[model samples]
Target chain A: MIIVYTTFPDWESAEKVVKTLLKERLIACANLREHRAFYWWEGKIEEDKEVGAILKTREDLWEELKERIKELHPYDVPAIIRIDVDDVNEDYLKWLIEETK
Target chain B: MIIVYTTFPDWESAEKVVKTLLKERLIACANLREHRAFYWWEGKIEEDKEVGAILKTREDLWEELKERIKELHPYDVPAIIRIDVDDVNEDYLKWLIEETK
Candidate 1:
């Protein structure tokens, strides 16, 4: 299945992504949350703001899904990650497959 | 919804991220996994060992959640991905919506 990740500026921005993803059938589910980020940007230690969104989808359609996301993304360097899904509930997986088909 | 992504050195670190996400109501759930990463780094092939954490949240309240995440993440280059959700059970979706409200 397809999974995507990202941080939101705020809840509304996150919800915008979620509503869009759902409308497009790019994911079967998404878990959203707030988080903490400490990193080095261009050799500078930085503590930044962020939010999180984890998504799940059918396996075959991921490629198109990623492209679709890139086209719609607002980030200069959008953090779009994909992971193959394993060990999901059979019924849920089956429904995903059906929807994609 | 909120989503976060990063490569943890070990399970312990990954669990820590998940824990904070849950504690903050930034995420209602997260799935932790280990993965093999093959990609380009500075115009070269990079075979990297990595572990992943997938998460879930609601249709609302992602801003406060993401800002919280930025403060705690440890990475030179943190990977935060966001994908809009697609199909889902109404019960689960409803549960998620009610959670952050």
Candidate 2:
């Protein structure tokens, strides 16, 4: 399994994208939370409130899944980063695989 | 950069661990959120509310960071999973690398 990490402007946008992907069977589950993000915007540091999401899906679906997120994401240059999971419990892994297409 | 994903029983525990790690220079930052977790326990499916965390730090800190989380975690069998980041923005990457020991 792989977890895709991305951030949205707020909870609403995050939920919308997460639910849409879940309904499309692109991801099995997602965890969303409000966070204070610090990064570079132009030539300086920028700090803002962002809703980050961790979406769980199959490894093979990464390419298609990433493209789909880019299409739905609000950010022009969204942080559509992939995180490869080294290990997961058997039961959770089973459910994750069964839920995603 | 790499993200260490784990769960805590509540916000207090999550905050405590995240803050401790930050103060100790074990991690650069962390995002926490509540979610419904489904997994098997004792041969039956168990579902419950959990506070999941996404911890960011340098790649080399994985071994030390994972061990520290295990020591601080509340659950005996916590989900101390590593998610290897495939890509990260150069600016963010620089900041992350600078913040951690």
Candidate 3:
């Protein structure tokens, strides 16, 4: 399994993308949350309130999932990081497989 | 090292899990945030606000940690996902070891 992490400007935009992904069955579940970030934006260090999406899906679907999120994302260069998993609860993993497949 | 991502119905629920896990030395540091969910519940799409927890821990403790969270979680089926990290800030990883061990 793989979990994808992405950040958005606000909750509304993040919610939009998450619902679309869930509706399309691209991801089994998504957690959209508030993120406090510090990064280089256009030259200066900027600290802003952001929304983040923690998406759960099968490892095999990552490439296409990444592309779909990118297309729906508002940022020119969105933050999309993938983290691979080796262990999970059996029931939860089963749910993910059922939803994604 | 691995990052475990889980979703809760609200911040209160997520916070309880985080504190219990932290006090039990199951996790190092946990970031609690808001999760907006979209899912087909009872045959209809629903939009609801939720909470999420992003936890940092060592790979070795994953099994026991997973079991502990399942025990403490309120939901009949909670979203508990593990994400392996190939790279992370050196200092942050050090902090995890110190806190978890």
Candidate 4:
């Protein structure tokens, strides 16, 4: 499975993206948490209270998922990144496959 | 190191998982926040207010930690996924290793 990460300006925007992804069946589920994000942007260090989101989906659907995120995201260059999942529980993985199907 | 994601129907369940992982030394720390999750279930889309959690642990301990989650998770099919972290703060990484080991 591919675990994708992205950030939104607030919880509302983050929830919006999650809802859209769920509706499109691009993601099986997602987790969102509040955090203060610090990063380098435009050659300067910036910090903001951001909503960190992680989306769960299969490897094949990642491209479409990324494109969808890019299309709907508020930022021109959103922090959209994919991370490989080495292992997961059998039942949960099976359910994810069924849901994303 | 590995970052695992999971969700629970409430913050209590989420916090319980985090505490168990921490007590067993399978994970160093975790972050939890509230979010309304939308997903497909049965034959339609469903939404629920849930607690999203992220637990940080070492790669080697993941199997054991996963077992621990499976054994304790209230849902038969809990949302448990792993994500590869390519970059992290040096200080935090160092602390994680020391704490986990």
Each model's DockQ score: 0.03, 0.20, 0.57, 0.54
Candidates' C-alpha lDDT: 0.62, 0.82, 0.83, 0.84
Worst 10 residues of 1 chain A by lDDT: A38-47
Regions of candidate 4 where Cα sits further than 4 Å from its true position: A10-12, A36-50, B84-101
Off by more than 4 A, model 2: A1-4, A8-49, A53-80, A83-101
The Cα error of candidate 3 at residue A84, in Å, is 1.7
Per-residue alpha-carbon lDDT of model 1 for A1-101, expressed as tens digits?
66666556567777787778888877777798665443334233334446778877776766676676666666544455555555788888888776553
Q: How accurate is candidate 1 locally (lDDT)?
A: 0.62
Q: What is the lDDT of residue B9 in candidate 2?
A: 89
Measured against the true structure, the TM-scores of the candidates, in listed sequence, are 0.48, 0.61, 0.78, 0.78
Q: Give the TM-score of candidate 3.
A: 0.78
> Model 2, clash count?
0
Better of 1 and 4 by TM-score: 4
Give Cα distance to truth, residue A26, candidate 2, Å.
16
Q: Is candidate 2 or candidate 3 better by DockQ?
A: 3
**lDDT for each residue of candidate 3 in A39-58, tens digit (9 for 90 to 100):** 98879999999987778889
Docking class of 4: medium
Top DockQ: which candidate number?
A: 3
The regions of model 3 sitting more than 4 angstroms off are A36-49, B87-101
